RNA sequence: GACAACUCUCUCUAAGGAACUCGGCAAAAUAGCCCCGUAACUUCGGGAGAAGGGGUGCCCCCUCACAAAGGGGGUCGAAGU
RNA sequence: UUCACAUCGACGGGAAGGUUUGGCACCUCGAUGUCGGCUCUUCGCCACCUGGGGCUGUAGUAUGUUCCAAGGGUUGGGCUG
RNA sequence: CAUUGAGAGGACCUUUCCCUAGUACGAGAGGACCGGGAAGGACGCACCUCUGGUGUACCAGUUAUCGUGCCCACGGUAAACGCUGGGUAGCCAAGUGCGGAGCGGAUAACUGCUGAAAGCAUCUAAGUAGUAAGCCCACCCCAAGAUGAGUGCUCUCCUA
RNA sequence: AAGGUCACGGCGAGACGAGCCGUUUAUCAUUACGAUAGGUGUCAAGUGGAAGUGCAGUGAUGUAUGCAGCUGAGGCAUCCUAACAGACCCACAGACUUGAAC
């Protein structure tokens, strides 16, 4: 039974479940729109805050963790040098989720995030 | 795990019905969807 | 936690060496048997000379098991080694010293067992 | 029936509470988020029998029907979300209007039966609902877990009925018997009751004296 | 003044330790510390049993915080669970600190003996 | 999308270790390279990798060919093919 | 010991059961898949054990037998399919 | 919303010790079921405080290799995560908590009480007493689709 | 209309329907009610000493800064993000008999 569990998962096996999130997050914070299914809207909504708020603190022992995390190597470099004027006492809560028709074959329900 | 015999057109239609008619709980939804879609203040639908 | 197929030491020299646990006695259960417990400990391996020779059913107790063991005041004490004392059925063992430290509790039923440890703890 | 009116709390956690003594003893605790406050009694003679209704959790008016806040209005009463009448043996001497009770008496009455709604386990199977057994896993067999047989042949022609497939476990609310009470705190308004009580803790929890 | 939240588990475990703690002073406990425990027993006359031995693990959680120790004694590997606000403790003693590398000695159960002689 | 039961492909499982069972079937477990030792029997070829035991990770050092390997010392992990 | 009936009851007789071995062969050969285990039932008693009682060649402790009693309980293994 | 509850269901199980008492009973050997007290056992309902299992959120050691230009630091990969240690919540148990009751009414076998049919007797024909884990209520969970569809304290509007 | 349902935010609830709790000026104030999910801030808790720089070492490696560092589905605080917009079902006094009281 779920009762408890709170790790938001996807229709995806763990390995791949993870190259999703960062693969998709990246594209995010590349972006800053985004049209993904619900689900992996509220997934990328976890991380993608985590991101933000590791760029607020710029030291480079921080700047190496998303170094790891995120795949694309400039995003990071604009990202960090970048937010700390942006989201300067935005202070968590950086996202929107901005919802839109579903998916014409899937009828799956479609979303759109944003950086707000 | 062989059905033994055929239905009549009774039941037929009725789980047909049923059927159909689950259709029909589902567009009172996307009417809503639409009547609230139509211009108005709303956070969705970019 | 003493299934029915089990080896024991011993913590005697009543001359035993191994043995192995035939369904407990007492408590109706035997699916189980712990500290405090008799079970029917048919001999393994002996050394060579002692009046318990190779495969003698006989009559032991549990002083020492590897699962957990609760108490009163919250503490659990818990062995490596799963042993018996081979026993009589009206009171004193039949081997004299004893090894290795026993649960001070089963004294309220076995007196002669616990005044010939050496740890009560 | 029940022996005595009772009040219902909430579960909180678990703990240990060390006996002076030096005995460790696990404990639950109880706590009201509002005041249980009887808001109706009902006679042998204007109904058909002797209980009081209690309630809990105060709650913003919003949040509660019209119904509602006209039957908590009519006592002239705080509202309440929860609410629940204890049938007593019919010798009520209570006004409706905000008696407003309190643990000076599971004190006194040191065994305590309380009524909680247990936690739901979805669609549990056979193996587990009823305590059944499994197959072999192995000797080539290949029914693992599942319900095994069912019936008899030809003469009982169908399944006894009641008998015991899987199916939905938890969910409805159970007893616990003379549940003994144990050193309370009323600066805090919480209750270290002994034992384990059903729920996780943040549900409502019935809490009457035994019936012995 | 104001009024208890609805999280008051916490505080009631916190209030609890705190009386233990004033009762009496224990040092932190740290994963490989050497300890002795003069622990006060139900009738035996003297009643002060002495427990030495090395802290295989500590379980942290309010008034259960307890420490699982390791000695050898004529054989056999005894391995305790103690509480420490157990008002029982007469009292503990950290002797040593072997400096392990870790959190939780599991392993040093089932190496040679030789390293668990307290 | 959700994440019931249950079937399969898999990982782990406290304490015991065949008690299951028609039968330890199926799992699990050994395992590589060096080094010690290797029995009953035998057609005297075999058995025999019998059995069984030990070291092996990285760093520093000089030797034996002085291409490898070995000797000495150190350091690290719970665990070194 | 005497004493038919505490207990066993020769010689013969009268029943109920339906589950053993059978007798018929009535349904079923355009098919009603066998023994033994596993899992899960549920029911019957003429009762093995627990609840109450007589009688006893019952001192007590054990019993032996019958009477009401199906609410419950009715192990783990070694050998054999 | 709160609910009575016809009906239906689960559960009321069982051993060993001690006090009674070495008493009664017995030449002694031995050694009382009248009642209490505890420990169990199987079972049932739960629960995470403790002990632990798993925990593919997580932390750490580490093998081989590819990528981040490079060293450091990381990331990917090895039928789901490479193999291992440790683990919060959750779910579990070999863990823990509790439970089988003053129960009360009819009974069956049986023992009776008064007492004729039958100027004795007989537990029975009149009438009554005791008494079984068996029956019913009690216990615990559903339950007015109980179409016999109950109950009451609140609401909701009479403008067409 | 009372009440609902849908929608929207989710759960110790759940196969799906069910249930249950929300649904923003998400108070403000003199002792309980208006934080639902996320994010953030902090604390329990876990693992166990981060990175960089320094020192000691020829080098593995150690050592200090340092219960630090990464964890933070648990606890409170925080309206930063999202519960926006809506839509729909729901009605007008509940036929017929006698009885009773004023």
């Given at each position: 039974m779920k009762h408890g569990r709170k790790i938001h998962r996807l229709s995806r096996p763990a390995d791949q479940r993870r190259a999703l999130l960062r693969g998709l997050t990246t594209q995010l914070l590349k972006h800053g729109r985004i049209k993904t299914t619900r689900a992996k809207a509220s997934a990328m909504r976890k991380y993608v805050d985590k991101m933000i708020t590791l760029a607020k603190e710029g030291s480079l022992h921080k700047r190496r963790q998303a170094l790891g995390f995120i795949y694309e190597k400039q995003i990071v470099h604009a990202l960090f040098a970048e937010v700390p004027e942006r989201y300067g006492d935005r202070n968590g809560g950086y996202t929107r989720i901005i919802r839109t028709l579903p998916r014409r074959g899937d009828n799956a329900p479609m979303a759109y995030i944003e950086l707000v | 795990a062989v059905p033994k015999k055929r239905t009549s057109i009774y039941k037929k239609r009725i789980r047909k019905n049923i059927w159909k008619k689950k259709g029909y709980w589902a567009a009172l939804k996307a009417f809503s969807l639409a009547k609230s879609l139509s211009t108005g203040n709303s956070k969705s639908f970019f | 936690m003493i299934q029915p197929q089990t080896h024991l030491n011993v913590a005697d020299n009543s001359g035993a060496r191994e043995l192995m646990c035939i369904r407990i006695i007492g408590a109706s259960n035997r699916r189980y048997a712990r500290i405090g417990d008799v079970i029917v400990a048919v001999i393994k391996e002996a050394i060579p000379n002692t009046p318990l020779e190779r495969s003698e059913v006989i009559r032991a107790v549990v002083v020492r098991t590897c699962k957990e063991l609760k108490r009163d005041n919250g503490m659990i004490i818990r062995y490596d080694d799963n042993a018996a004392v081979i026993i009589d059925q009206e009171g004193n063992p039949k081997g004299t010293r004893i090894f290795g430290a026993i649960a001070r509790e089963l004294r309220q039923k076995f007196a002669k067992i616990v005044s010939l440890a050496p740890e009560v703890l | 029936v029940d022996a005595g009116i009772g009040v219902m709390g909430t579960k909180l956690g678990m703990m240990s509470f060390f006996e002076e003594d030096g005995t460790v003893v696990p404990v639950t605790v109880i706590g009201f988020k509002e005041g249980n406050i009887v808001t109706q009694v009902k006679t042998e003679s204007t109904d058909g029998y002797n209980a009081v209704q209690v309630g809990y959790e105060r709650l913003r008016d919003r949040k509660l029907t019209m119904p509602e806040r006209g039957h908590l209005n009519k006592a002239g009463v705080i509202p309440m979300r929860h609410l629940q009448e204890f049938r007593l043996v019919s010798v009520d001497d209570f006004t409706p209007s905000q008696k407003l009770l309190f643990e000076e008496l599971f004190k006194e009455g040191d065994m305590v039966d309380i009524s909680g709604t247990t936690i739901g386990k979805g669609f549990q199977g056979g193996?587990?609902?009823?305590?059944?057994?499994?197959?072999?896993?192995?000797?080539?067999?290949?029914?693992?877990?599942?319900?095994?047989?069912?019936?008899?042949?030809?003469?009982?022609?169908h399944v006894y009925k009641g008998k015991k497939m899987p199916g939905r476990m938890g969910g409805t609310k159970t007893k616990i018997r003379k549940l003994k009470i144990m050193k309370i705190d009323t600066d805090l308004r919480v209750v270290m009751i002994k034992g384990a009580v059903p729920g996780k803790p943040g549900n409502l929890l019935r809490l009457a004296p035994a019936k012995i | 003044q104001r009024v208890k939240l609805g999280d008051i588990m916490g505080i009631l475990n916190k209030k609890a330790v705190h009386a233990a703690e004033e009762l009496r002073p224990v040092p932190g406990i740290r994963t490989g510390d050497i300890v002795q425990i003069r622990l006060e027993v139900p009738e035996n006359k003297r009643r002060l049993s002495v427990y030495k031995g090395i802290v295989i693990s500590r379980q942290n959680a309010g008034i259960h915080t307890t420490i699982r120790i390791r000695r050898i004694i004529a054989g056999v590997g005894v391995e305790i669970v103690f509480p420490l606000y157990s008002p029982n403790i007469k009292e503990i003693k950290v002797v040593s600190h072997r400096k392990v590398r870790k959190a939780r000695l599991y392993y040093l159960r089932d190496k040679l003996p030789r390293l668990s002689t307290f």
């Open positions: - | - | - | 193996i587990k609902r009823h305590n059944f057994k499994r197959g072999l896993m192995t000797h080539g067999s290949k029914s693992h877990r599942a319900l095994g047989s069912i019936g008899a042949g030809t003469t009982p022609g | -």
